[PDB]
Amino acid sequence: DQGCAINFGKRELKCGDGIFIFRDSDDWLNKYSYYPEDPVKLASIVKASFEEGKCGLNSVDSLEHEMWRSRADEINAIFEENDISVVVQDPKNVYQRGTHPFSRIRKNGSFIIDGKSRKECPFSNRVWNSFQIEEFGRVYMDAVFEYTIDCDGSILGAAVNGKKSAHGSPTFWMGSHEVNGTWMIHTLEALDYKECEWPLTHTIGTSVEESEMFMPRSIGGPVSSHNHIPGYKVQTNGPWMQVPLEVKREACPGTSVIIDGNCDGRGKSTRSTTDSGKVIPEWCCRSCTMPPVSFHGSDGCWYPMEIRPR
Amino acid sequence: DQGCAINFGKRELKCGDGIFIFRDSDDWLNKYSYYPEDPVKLASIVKASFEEGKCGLNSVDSLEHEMWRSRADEINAIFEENEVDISVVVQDPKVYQRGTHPFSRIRKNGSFIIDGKSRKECPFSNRVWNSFQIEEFGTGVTRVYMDAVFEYTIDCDGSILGAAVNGKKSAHGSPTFWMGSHEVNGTWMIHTLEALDYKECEWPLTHTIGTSESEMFMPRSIGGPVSSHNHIPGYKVQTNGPWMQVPLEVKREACPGTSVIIDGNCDGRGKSTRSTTDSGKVIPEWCCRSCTMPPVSFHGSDGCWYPMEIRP
């Protein structure tokens, strides 16, 4: 990796060789060309998997969904030639957990790629995480017949430096820093809602319990010391199911939080506006930090589980 | 951090933002100009430590030793001008060991030996080891600034470390250490390891990658990441290894003029032994228990050495 970074805090320019992790993989929104195994073996794989009694798939991330939407037509043409057709519907960005791996090779039935749990096949009868990537990047994919719950490590990244760190992915970016001795989040952009856990071999400083972390493990978020914000426990019932998120350290427009010690807390997150689009600027919280945190997603301003409407 | 990686001939260019670590920290050998706390208060600190019963210091890294060598004279001059019967002399550990005291808080020619042989009068007990912290990492056109600390700590300083992982690639870094792992057919395994000192500060738990103590190649106490990335298959922890040498280079190749054959009959797990004997003659009769086909061999001061699993 022959490159040439430049800092501005410590004022370096140092060039040479090493390891680089770019965020801009979060910005190359559509440049990949996902080529699965081949236009033949994949067809037989899905045909067999349907023939065993798996109604439809369940994408794991936006990359899988894009690949399937682009390559449904080739598989349909192949089957035409050699009684099943794949119809790729749309989840907004809320890829949930399927509970089956692919199956081994040996009316108009359908293999819905990721559809609503319409009482005809629940999430139980779906294949979720049964691909793995061989080339970093055009990306080639290979099928797998073993169930897994950890995300694919071939596309992840992590890095630490002097008082700086960053957990990356093409659809995720968390950036921590150390101030006054401790490590705490300061950037967080999520473009999906995955449910694959972060692998241990790509976490930095795995020496924590799952009770101080900000982003929970199941939603997919590194299990480390860098992943937590002081004064806030795990965000189980957070606003994680939304479209592109951003965790921000500022009170949401028109509202205010006054640090108290008498108002109940630790329930579920609540939007700043009511169901009729009216703000409620009467927010309290228990012992929290001086500024509040607030997500910025699909509906807009949400608040963490420690900030309640008084 | 707006930098990028370039491919020659292919003439691609991918710039942006992120985190960048470079090996070349093990290439830039002499540009640092270390500045201590200040010319005046460091003198008072070492004077107070001497008054409380600490014979001398003990450097931990090459950076501290070079700083002391460069800046002993200023402290000597300040001491002279303040009329005090002390003077610091700095010797030369070729191998930095462990003291047991932090700097003491401020409130015939005595000797405050920086790092010299344990001459049965100033043992390691009366020595200060790890009492500094880099605050700013300089500007350059680098000038590392150091601030005292009065609490004993056995971890190294994180302001100069760095770790990174990517698709099937990893690297733990320092200006005096570079381990680089990769993932081939399953697990992770070292493929490059260059050490320039013999430190004894443990790697910090917050700058490791995959912290999930009997398979690690480089031991913990010598100072080496506690991670799954830190091991070589078939070779267990290197307690009595050849770590005490000047720049090492863990190489995966047979040693010159020798030969290794895997055997299920010979002894193992002893101590590291050099390829050439005490008289400069090789011994090409090397055996190994369960090991791997390409043997590993530390290349240090005297040349070839061998791990603890390979015996003559």
Residue numbers in the entry:
A (entry chain a): 1 to 82, 85 to 108, 129 to 159, 166 to 338
B (entry chain A): 1 to 94, 96 to 108, 129 to 162, 165 to 235, 238 to 337
Sentences from the paper on this structure:
Moreover, the sNS1 lipoprotein is involved in virion production, immune evasion, and multiple aspects of pathogenesis. The NS1 monomer has 352 amino acids, forms 2 α-helices and 20 β-strands, and contains 12 conserved cysteine residues that form 6 intramolecular disulfide bonds. The NS1 monomer consists of three distinct domains: a β-roll domain (residues 1–29, β1–2), a wing domain (residues 38–151, β4–7 and α1–2), and a β-ladder domain (residues 181–352, β10–20). β3, β8, and β9 are from a ‘‘connector’’ domain (residues 30–37 and 152–180) and connect the wing to the β-roll and β-ladder domains.
The cryoEM structure of the YFV sNS1 tetramer is determined at a global resolution of 3.57 Å and is further improved to 3.31 Å by focusing the refinement on one of the dimers. The local resolution map shows that one of the dimers is blurry with a worse resolution, indicating its flexibility. Then, we performed focused refinement by applying a mask on one of the dimers and improved the resolution to 3.31 Å. The atomic models of the YFV_NS1_tetramer and focused refined dimer were built according to the density map. The chains were named AaBb and Aa for NS1 tetramer and dimer, respectively. The β-roll domain, the greasy finger (loopβ8–β9), and loopβ5–β6 in the wing periphery region form the ‘inner’ hydrophobic face, while the wing domain and β-ladder form the outer surface. In addition, we also use the Alpha fold to generate the 3D model of the YFV NS1 dimer. The structural comparison showed that the RMSD of the two dimers structures is 0.847 Å, suggesting the modelled dimer structure is very similar to that of the YFV_NS1 dimer.
